[PDB]
Structure 1
């Protein structure tokens, strides 16, 4: 028994419609997408940064590794 012992609530009214009287995915352009954009916007500069930073470190380290595999001509300039 967990329903009926949860919280002491007073003076709140709620109105709801049967699922058959309404649409499943309403106002995709006027409400949905705008919000999706809103949500993306509000988070991008919190998530993206460290991932971008990770990428850079990855690129540097990968290139720096391949670069150390190449030969430096300055080791054979007097090997006549």
Structure 2
């Protein structure tokens, strides 16, 4: 501290905790923001897990069919 960095002319205003509302517009803007956030990251995150779900189901069903007796066999 005091030597961490060299900045200049950057003024920084702030308020006391007890002087400001604890949850200013928490759900007022929180929801919009959370939603804003989800739409900037959903296309990068979700489709891999979607195809994991498809591969998992596929594997399960395929495995079952694999186990299901071959009707043609044994006849």
- Alignment TM-score > 0.5, same fold: yes
TM-score (norm. length: structure 2): 0.91
Question: In the alignment, which residue of structure 2 is the partner of 1:34?
Answer: 32
The TM-score with structure 1 as length reference comes to 0.86
After TM superposition, where is structure 1 displaced by more than 4 Å over at least 4 residues in a row?
A: none
Q: Which residue of 1 aligns with 2:56?
A: 58
The structural deviation recorded for 1:74 is: 1.0
| 1:16-62 deviation per Cα after TM superposition (whole angstroms, max 9, x unaligned) | 00000111211124321100000011111110010101111111011
Max Rg structure? 1
**Unaligned stretches of 5+ residues in structure 1:** none
Which structure 2 segments of 5+ residues have no match?
Answer: none
